[PDB]
């Protein structure tokens, strides 16, 4: 997905 | 937000502290009532996807609701990935997460507009919508 569980609203993925 | 300045020239100019705190109260106050989002609008006007992500970030305490939001927003962005076959931008983009804010004011103000604040704006709101049904 864009926006895991507590990553927050705008957050680049850590992947 | 990008607005029209006084020459008739759309520039952007960063999300004041002062609309900021604004919708900390409108979301303290009213939590999710049907008016939430008329002042999100409202305070919204000309967002970026950057400055709406400003905003939602300011939300604390809502933690279910705010799950819910995110739902959206990824389904949301694979339907519009699904529908825009691969610069151009990808549903991740348009949320904020791998677009800079350079690159969205260029959509912004793309000749057409890609108008990624418009869309992403959208996104946010069917979510709130959601939101406001689950507390009616």
Known sequence: ?15 | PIVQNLQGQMVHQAISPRTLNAWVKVVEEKAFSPEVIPMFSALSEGATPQDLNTMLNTVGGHQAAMQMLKETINEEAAEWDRLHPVREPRGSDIAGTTSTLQEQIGWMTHNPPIPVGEIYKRWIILGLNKIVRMYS
Do not use: R
């Not at chain 1, 997905?1 to 992947?15: K, T």
């Open chain 1, 1 to 15: 997905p864009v926006l895991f569980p507590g990553q927050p609203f705008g957050q680049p993925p850590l992947g």
